[PDB]
Design an enzyme around this catalytic site. Structure first.
Site, mmCIF file in Angstrom:
data_model
loop_
_atom_site.group_PDB
_atom_site.id
_atom_site.type_symbol
_atom_site.label_atom_id
_atom_site.label_comp_id
_atom_site.label_asym_id
_atom_site.label_seq_id
_atom_site.Cartn_x
_atom_site.Cartn_y
_atom_site.Cartn_z
ATOM 1 N N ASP A 299 62.677 79.251 33.419
ATOM 2 C CA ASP A 299 61.341 78.690 33.551
ATOM 3 C C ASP A 299 60.956 77.884 32.311
ATOM 4 O O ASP A 299 61.267 78.265 31.182
ATOM 5 C CB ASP A 299 60.347 79.831 33.787
ATOM 6 N N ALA A 371 36.029 80.474 27.729
ATOM 7 C CA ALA A 371 36.417 80.316 29.125
ATOM 8 C C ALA A 371 35.277 79.789 29.987
ATOM 9 O O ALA A 371 35.525 79.076 30.965
ATOM 10 C CB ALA A 371 36.914 81.649 29.681
ATOM 11 N N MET A 375 35.325 74.165 26.876
ATOM 12 C CA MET A 375 35.138 73.061 25.949
ATOM 13 C C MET A 375 34.879 73.637 24.567
ATOM 14 O O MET A 375 34.242 74.683 24.423
ATOM 15 C CB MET A 375 33.970 72.162 26.386
ATOM 16 N N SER A 376 35.375 72.933 23.555
ATOM 17 C CA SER A 376 35.110 73.243 22.160
ATOM 18 C C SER A 376 34.624 71.981 21.476
ATOM 19 O O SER A 376 34.797 70.871 21.985
ATOM 20 C CB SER A 376 36.356 73.778 21.445
#
Ligand SMILES: CCCCCCCC/C=C/CCCCCCCC(=O)OC[C@H](COP(=O)(O)OCCN)OC(=O)CCCCCCCCCCCCCCC
Ligand SMILES: [K+]
Lengths: 674, 27, 186, 557
Positions: A299, A371, A375-376
């Site tokens: 994976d 969450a 956005m930060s």
């Protein structure tokens, strides 16, 4: 190969020299019954009724006993090393103490006990700092654990009482909390203990390939038993018959005793060596399946992601400058303490030496990664600067009374064409731009996949992205087949597709979500960070939690098979030179005419056969290091690897016996024993 | 034929019996 | 079982019955001489096929290769070879006897007798000798038959048989027809 | 000389390949079960009339069909030879072969060996020859080809469980492949000088007073089939050197081509059927390199020959002791290696009188397993047992699991392969031991010492490998040798055929995965190398003890 283990495997060999314990190696059993037969002949000669020269048949029977003892010794040594590795793994668990509570409720005087004596009925406490000594059930309280031994990614997990977290394992490292557990005798939470008990006992399943190879060695032993035994009528017609002692010597020498003896040592050496590579096999079958895997579903995340994506291109929403764009992106990403934000800031400084921001720009309110907002940012100015995903930024600008300019979305579509997940930056309520963050391959993996491609193992990526970015990353890494939006059932479908062609499939998957695939897979390296339900799927169990380890498991598989084959050829060939050492020096009194085949110029018939047998035993003890450290091999293409191992060990098996027998004969003559 | 030769024949046949038996099994 | 039995009876007929019958009727349709043994008739007596050679022991008759047949040499009822190996000293004693007889019968030709005349034949009914060996005799035969050398060599040429390609066999004289031609030539 | 031996070999192989590729496609069409171009109406009416049908056979039923046919052939042949004084075509009233010789000849001809202790011209009437020996020549060769057809269909089928039916393969092989080509080679010999008639033994009043009794019989038919079907049992005693079986050098060449016509055609057909001709070429390159080096050794040993001849007074040390004179030593040597490599067993120069080294090489090519271009059909499947062995070793030293043409090779093939490879060394060695111990066994030599034992080893070695060649000094007519060699031939042939069919039955239930980029090509100089190496090493390791007291000890004498 150190003294302690050597002496212990030597005593084990002597104790495994009795016959009732070597039914199961007909090549060594023919050497054993031969040895017994010639010691009986030797005794009869030494005091009784036989032709004479008691010594030479006692020396032949002594060296044949040594050959049996060296075969038993090689196997005992392999098993000794295996036991050492197993006990060292268990000793990772034995490094822990254990604090036992007198009263089951939390808070009491506890005494430290080594992490093996905890049994059913005990109530033990495990506080911050110690290692969980043994399994059991949580009865009161709640702690966060790191599962460090049973989990190699160090991600925390909360463990509270009265819930689904009452299953506790042994050996892991605890964190800054506390837990009260009750030791139980229910099935454990480790797959280590299981194999540890498996190999430590007196049992081992022959693997299909090593049964085929035993069928080959047994056919060789029958063919040579018939030849060397029918030498007696022929000789006895032509003159004075060949002795029985020289015939048992010729029979033992010809019989593939090298690979005969070492076969089992090779099997257990491969298992021990893999155990050294930290993966807990279940049976030789799984190791040789590893040796046969034609595809490994690695994976993308884990090995081909190298952490998280980093910025690649600057895309302005307002035709802004790349310098001020990277400055505002890093300013807003300083509040994103995740690796992604740190990488964005680092690539900004690296791209345009926008390195530092003094305190005067500071005295701000940092927006951590959340969450709910997705956005930060930083509210340095009266406007709010932000950074987040595309969907959350569109939803927040639509929520913040702003708007997204169409050019911004068009450029986002351009990034979608590039194959990179686009990140967006917004200043106040007007979008500042988007930065393209393409994920890196591990960097040093395209070459290993190329080598595997040469060996014949078609790598296969399995990613959750779409069938454009997945192809991009595929070509970027050096893989062959790639899947987009990988869903477990689709993974299982692909597995059965590749199995239908006859190809074996290798896989690394933690978590129950991949459990059915793992069980369906042929070499399923269940990572040791996943659920016990996934580890129990089995066929392999890792411990370093490195999905690349499957590559090493395939190197070990093909090393083990190469060792078997290589020594087989070494033994068959070896017989060609033993014929020139024995035939003209066994018949040097019946048919004088046959001295011309004594090409090695061996000293005397008696010395010639004593020397051939000695070389037989010394080869079995010289080739141990190789039969335990495997046959070194570089992944050349299949035909060229055949050509390298035929050159190396075909001429091993012709040119080494000449030097061998002639040097042992030379030594015997010098010392003055013949 | 003789004591020694009969014992020899019998022992070689015994070892071939055991070997073929091993060649017809997984041991 | 009806397949097995019928297949076997049918291949018994087609091979055993028919196939010999077809080859035998084509053989007598096309090649009535080579097929019936290649006999060399004369008057009514059958003076030996031109393929199985004869035992020649006169002194005006070319000599084929020694026989080693069961009874009297060149006896096509046993047609064994001479399986005497090389190690067997009896072969060396036989070769010594033959070489002595040959050398003492041909006193003008070479002292070294060719190997064809000294040894036996794989069939024992071998009719032929390489024209070298036939040429070796010529002194004695010339003397016995009052035939000059040139015409006798011409005669060996007429009855020699080069093979198709130069290496599938080797040149070959035909001793039976040869000696018969001699008797005619008298 | 030998400058003109290498031409002989070059022309022989070149012509054999030219003649073999066509017939190779022929047998490819038969293996695939497609009517040979013209015969579908005839095939249909005939099969319907007989009782054979379209229904196919699994490995058990195929094997049991072929063994039922062979064992029935053995019953009728043993009874013909045991009562030929009650059957017609007796030119000279001849008695019924004794029980021991009857059993030996029967078991020999049923199992394609055609060992011959009798004397064809004084012991067998025509009817036995015409409808005894020749018929079982046809059916032994058809059985061999039906078994290699089963094996090749096993390799080229996937997930089926039926190897096509055995009666159809026997009928098409006999009627289409063998009867025509054999009727054509037989008309060729009847031109060159062989004889094909039923006249009584014709009197002969030689040009001298003496008299002889020429034999006669159906010789050209039985020649065409004794070669083409790699049998060896020619009519007369010195089978393929008698001037009535092989009259001129040109029929000798047609007989060498015929000895290899069908084994080589089978290799090319095998190459075709798999779709990848390179497998067929691989096989031919291995078998050809062994055969050519062998014929080099023999031609050289002979042209050195017996040095006593040069000392004793002769003109050249050439070893024309056994050999015929219509053939040189070059052609007789090439025919010894051809006859014993292919398990044809038709001697053209009494193999006893070959110089020690010259006789080791044919003797060895027999003991090797009759691998190099072996007998009709027996060649390919014996070669394939060695190929499974070599594929196993290679796969084992590549890491791969063994594979040949896409089909894996698990233990159930390994057991069967080891047993089939075993069957012939065990017979030849145990037999040589039995003969050299029992008094009757070693009172049937002609040469003493080393070469004396060589005769016994070569007789047992030919018999148990189904060769039929023989050192011809060994008086093999005493009931001991009849029963011993009869059992050896029987277990040789059928002991190999039963595991081969078990192999085919176990290789038809697999599925042939494609050729990935990491499977060792089974075609090319390195795998032909490893095949030659496997064959020569196994053969040499097994038999250098036995051969160190036979030929070699004589050579160094
Ligand atoms: C006593 C034994 C000792 C035997 C030891 C000798 C064998 C070592 C061979 C070394 C060759 C070095 C040449 C290296 C330099 C030449 C380079 C070149 O041009 O090609 C060369 C062609 C490749 O062709 P390729 O592969 O298809 O090509 C690349 C495509 N993928 O190999 C060749 O020479 C092939 C000829 C060699 C045949 C070897 C078979 C003998 C094995 C016998 C072992 C017995 C086994 C035990 C059985 C129980
Ligand atoms: K034969």
């Amino acid at each position: 190969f150190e003294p302690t283990l050597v002496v212990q495997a030597l005593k084990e060999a002597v104790k495994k020299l009795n016959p009732q314990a070597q039914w199961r190696n007909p090549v060594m059993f023919i050497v054993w019954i031969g040895s017994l037969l010639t010691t009986c002949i030797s005794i009869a000669m030494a005091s009784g009724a036989m032709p004479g020269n008691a010594l030479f048949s006692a020396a032949i029977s002594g060296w044949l006993w040594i050959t049996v003892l060296f075969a038993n010794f090689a196997e005992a040594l392999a098993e000794g090393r295996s036991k050492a590795q197993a006990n060292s793994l268990k000793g990772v668990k034995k490094t822990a103490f254990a604090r036992k509570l007198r009263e089951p409720k939390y808070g009491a005087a506890a005494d430290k006990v080594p992490a093996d004596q905890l049994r059913k009925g005990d109530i033990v406490l495990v506080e911050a700092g110690d290692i969980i000594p043994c399994d059991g059930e949580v009865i009161e309280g709640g702690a966060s654990v790191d599962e460090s031994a049973i989990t190699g990614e160090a991600a925390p997990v909360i463990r509270e009482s009265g819930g689904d977290f009452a299953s506790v394992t042994g050996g892991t490292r605890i964190l800054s909390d506390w837990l009260v557990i009750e030791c139980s005798v229910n099935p454990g939470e480790t797959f280590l203990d299981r194999m540890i008990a498996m190999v430590e006992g007196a049992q081992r399943r022959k693997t299909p390939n090593e049964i085929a190879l035993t069928i080959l060695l047994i056919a060789l032993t029958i063919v040579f038993l018939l030849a060397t035994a029918t030498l007696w009528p022929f000789s006895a017609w032509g003159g004075n018959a060949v002795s029985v002692t020289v015939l048992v010597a010729l029979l033992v020498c010809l019989i593939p005793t090298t690979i005969g003896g070492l076969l089992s040592a090779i099997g257990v050496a491969g298992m021990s060596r893999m155990l050294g590579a930290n993966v807990i096999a279940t049976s030789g079958r799984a190791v040789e399946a590893a040796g046969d895997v034609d595809v490994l579903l690695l994976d993308k995340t884990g090995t081909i992601t190298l952490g998280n994506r980093q910025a690649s291109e600057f895309i302005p929403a307002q035709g802004v400058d790349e310098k001020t764009l990277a400055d505002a992106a890093q300013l807003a990403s300083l509040a994103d303490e995740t690796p992604e934000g740190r990488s964005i800031v680092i690539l900004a400084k690296q791209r345009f030496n926008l390195r530092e921001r003094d305190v005067q720009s500071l005295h701000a309110t940092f927006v951590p990664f959340t969450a709910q907002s997705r956005m930060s940012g930083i509210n340095i100015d009266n406007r709010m600067i932000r950074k987040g995903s595309v969907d959350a930024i569109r939803r927040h600008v639509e929520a913040n009374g702003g708007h997204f300019p169409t050019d911004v979305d068009q450029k986002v579509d351009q990034v979608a064409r590039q194959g990179a997940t686009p990140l967006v930056v917004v200043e106040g309520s007007r979008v500042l731009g988007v930065i393209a963050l393409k994920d890196i391959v591990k960097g040093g993996i395209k070459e290993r996949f190329a080598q595997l491609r040469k060996m014949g193992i078609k790598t296969v990526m399995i990613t959750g992205d779409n069938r454009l970015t997945a192809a991009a990353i595929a070509a970027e890494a050096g893989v062959d087949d790639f899947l987009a939006e990988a869903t477990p059932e689709a993974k299982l479908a692909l597995i059965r597709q590749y199995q239908a062609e006859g190809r074996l499939v290798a896989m690394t998957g933690d978590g129950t979500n991949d459990a059915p695939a793992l069980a369906q897979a042929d070499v399923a390296v269940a990572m040791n960070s996943g659920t016990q339900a996934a580890k129990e799927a089995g066929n392999m169990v890792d411990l370093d939690s490195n999905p690349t380890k499957l590559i090493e498991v395939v190197h070990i598989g093909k090393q083990m098979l190469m060792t078997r084959g290589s020594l087989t050829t070494f033994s068959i060939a070896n017989d060609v030179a033993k014929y020139f050492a024995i035939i003209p020096a066994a018949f040097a009194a019946t048919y004088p005419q046959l001295n011309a085949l004594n090409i090695m110029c061996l000293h005397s018939p008696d010395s010639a056969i004593l020397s051939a047998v000695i070389f037989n035993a010394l080869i079995i003890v010289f080739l141990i290091p190789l039969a335990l450290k495997g046959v070194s091999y570089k992944p050349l293409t299949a035909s060229a690897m055949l050509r390298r191992n035929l050159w190396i060990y075909g001429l091993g098996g012709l040119l080494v016996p000449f030097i061998g027998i002639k040097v042992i004969d030379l030594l015997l003559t010098v010392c003055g024993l013949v | 034929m003789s004591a020694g030769v009969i014992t020899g024949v019998l022992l070689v046949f015994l070892l071939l019996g055991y070997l073929v038996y091993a060649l017809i099994n997984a041991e | 079982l009806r397949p097995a039995l019928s297949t076997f009876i049918f291949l018994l007929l087609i091979t055993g019955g028919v196939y010999p019958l077809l080859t035998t009727v084509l053989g007598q349709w096309w090649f009535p001489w080579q097929a019936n043994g290649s006999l060399i008739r004369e008057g009514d007596t059958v003076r030996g096929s031109a393929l199985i050679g004869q035992n020649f022991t006169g002194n005006g008759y070319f000599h084929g290769r020694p026989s080693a047949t069961a009874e009297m040499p060149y006896n096509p009822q046993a047609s064994g070879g001479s399986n005497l190996a090389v190690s067997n000293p009896e072969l060396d004693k036989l070769i010594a006897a033959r070489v002595a007889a040959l050398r003492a019968a041909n006193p003008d030709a070479s002292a070294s007798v060719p190997v064809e005349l000294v040894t036996a034949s794989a069939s024992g009914l071998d009719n032929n000798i390489t024209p070298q060996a036939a040429a070796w005799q010529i002194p004695r035969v010339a003397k016995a038959r009052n035939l000059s050398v040139e015409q006798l060599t011409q005669l060996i040429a007429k009855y020699s048989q080069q093979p198709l390609v130069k290496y599938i066999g080797q040149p070959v004289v035909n001793i039976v027809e040869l000696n018969l031609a001699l008797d005619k030539l008298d | 000389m030998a400058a003109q031996g290498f031409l002989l070999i070059a022309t022989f192989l070149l012509v054999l390949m030219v003649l073999a590729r066509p017939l190779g496609s022929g047998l490819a069409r038969l293996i695939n079960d497609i009517p040979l171009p013209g015969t579908t109406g005839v095939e249909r009416v005939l099969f319907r009339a007989l009782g054979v049908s379209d229904r196919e056979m699994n490995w058990k039923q195929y094997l049991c069909a072929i063994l039922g046919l062979n064992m029935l052939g053995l019953a009728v042949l043993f009874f013909m030879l045991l009562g030929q004084h009650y059957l017609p075509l007796n030119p000279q009233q001849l008695p019924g072969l004794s029980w021991d010789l009857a059993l030996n000849t029967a078991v020999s001809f049923v199992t394609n060996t055609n060992w011959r202790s009798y004397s064809g011209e004084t012991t067998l009437s025509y009817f036995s020859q015409m409808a005894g020996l020749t018929v079982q020549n046809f059916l032994s060769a058809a059985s061999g080809i039906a078994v290699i057809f089963a094996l090749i269909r096993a390799f080229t089928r996937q997930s089926m469980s039926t190897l096509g039916n055995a009666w159809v393969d026997l009928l098409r092989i006999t009627l289409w492949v063998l009867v025509p080509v054999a009727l054509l080679i037989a008309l060729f010999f009847i031109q060159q000088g062989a004889l094909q008639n039923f006249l009584p033994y014709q009197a002969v009043n030689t040009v001298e007073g003496a008299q002889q009794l020429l034999p006669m019989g159906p010789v050209a038919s039985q020649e065409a089939i004794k070669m083409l079907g790699t049998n060896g049992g020619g009519f007369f005693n010195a089978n393929s050197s008698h001037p009535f079986e092989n009259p001129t050098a040109l029929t000798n060449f047609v007989q060498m081509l015929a000895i290899f016509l069908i084994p080589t055609a089978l290799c090319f057909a095998f190459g075709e059927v798999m779709g990848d001709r390179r497998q067929g070429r691989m096989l031919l390159w291995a078998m050809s390199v062994i055969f050519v080096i062998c014929v080099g050794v023999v031609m050289w040993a002979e042209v050195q020959g017996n040095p006593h001849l040069l000392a004793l007074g002769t003109d050249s040390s050439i070893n024309m002791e056994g050999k015929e004179s219509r053939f040189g030593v070059l052609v007789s040597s090439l025919f010894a290696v051809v006859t014993t490599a292919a398990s044809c067993g038709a001697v053209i120069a009494m193999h006893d009188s070959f110089t020690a080294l010259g006789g080791m090489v044919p003797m060895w090519l027999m003991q090797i397993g009759e691998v190099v271009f072996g007998g009709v059909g027996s060649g390919l499947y014996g070669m394939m047992l060695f190929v499974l062995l070599a594929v196993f070793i290679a796969g084992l030293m590549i890491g791969r699991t063994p594979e040949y043409l896409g089909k894996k090779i698990d233990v159930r093939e390994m057991k069967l392969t080891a047993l089939a490879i075993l069957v012939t060394p065990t017979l030849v060695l145990m037999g040589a031991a039995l003969a050299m111990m029992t008094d009757a066994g070693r009172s049937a030599m002609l040469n003493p010492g080393p070469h004396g034992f060589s005769e016994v080893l070569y007789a047992v070695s030919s018999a148990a490998n189904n060769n039929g060649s023989a050192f011809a000094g060994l008086s093999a007519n005493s009931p001991f040798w009849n029963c011993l060699l009869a059992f050896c031939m029987f277990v040789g042939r059928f002991g190999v055929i039963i595991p081969v069919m078990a192999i085919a039955g176990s290789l038809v239930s697999k599925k042939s995965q494609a050729a990935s980029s990491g499977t060792l090509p089974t075609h090319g100089p390195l795998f032909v190398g490893l095949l030659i190496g496997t064959v020569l090493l196994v053969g040499a390791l097994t038999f250098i003890p036995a051969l160190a007291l036979g030929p070699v000890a004589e050579y160094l004498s």
